[model samples]
Target: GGPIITTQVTIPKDLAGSIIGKGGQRIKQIRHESGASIKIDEPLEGSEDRIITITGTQDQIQNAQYLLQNSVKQYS
Candidate 1:
């Protein structure tokens, strides 16, 4: 098994709720499918972006990041 690692990504605030989805379901699906733990923090005061922290093995982290980035793409 690879060593566990953590990565943080900042995404557009407007898209944050969509990513989380209704009842926080989408984000939960991503975590379950990717085998990674994800934590989305509230946007910083006066900021228009939110920070998402992902923690898992290297492969898991990569997978989670890919899924999340793809999810965010629909907002573009």
Candidate 2:
């Protein structure tokens, strides 16, 4: 079995649109780029102030988080 890594990212209201992208494209990019399984908590529909979790190999998880952060930093 491979190692599982999990990281959380807080969803800011301002960047939520970008993070989600147009039809979850941004999150898809993260998954495609990092090869990690990403799960984002429901934001407005239910879980406000929640987090998005990425789980996979240590390297993949870290990469996913990094990409997501970079995307947000760049977009925001």
Candidate 3:
């Protein structure tokens, strides 16, 4: 019951499923490590970016984004 926040994270549309994993494994890592609630949004028809809404304390939010960036680096 303290101050909580959220962020809208966008990533390359091409990398979505890989980061999300075969059956939702990778995204789970974000939530588990950050102890946050992260939800994925459907691909936007107008853009090549995907979104994941992160809800939790501030530190973890940034860390989770870091994790996501690392994952992105793993690819191209």
Candidate 4:
């Protein structure tokens, strides 16, 4: 199977900035910390959800996605 796994993380308008962080620092952190490649998908014009794509091992991608989504959820 391919090594890339894509998952979507939905972010609300207010928390989108938090997940993205200043200068994309948060996303960068996840990529560095989780050891997975990531891509941030911007919403269509006049939309409010942020879609994040993770490509890696299943475990790696899930771990990274969970961390990122939880950040937007504000759980820790």
In TM-score terms, which candidate is top? 1
**Which tens-of-lDDT digit does each residue in 1-76 have in candidate 1?**
8998788889888888778787878888888887789877756779888898888898889888888778788877
lDDT of each: 0.83, 0.74, 0.79, 0.73
Query: By the lDDT metric, which is better: model 1 or model 2?
Result: 1
Q: What TM-score number comes out for model 4?
A: 0.74
| Pairs in clash, predicted candidate 2 | none
The runs of at least 3 residues in candidate 2 whose Cα sits more than 4 Å from the true structure, single-residue gaps closed, are 44-50
- At residue 15, give the lDDT of candidate 3: 87
TM-score of each: 0.88, 0.77, 0.82, 0.74
Predicted structure with the largest lDDT when compared to the true one: 1
Q: List the residue pairs that clash in candidate 3.
A: none
Clash count in backbone of candidate 4: 0
* Model 3 lDDT at residue 76: 74
Q: Which ten residues in a row have the lowest lDDT in candidate 4?
A: 1-10
Local error of candidate 3 at 37, Å?
A: 1.0
The local distance difference test score of model 4 is 0.73
- After superposing candidate 1, which stretches have Cα over 4 Å from the reference? none
Point out the higher-scoring one by lDDT: 3 or 4: 3
Ranking by TM-score: 1, 3, 2, 4
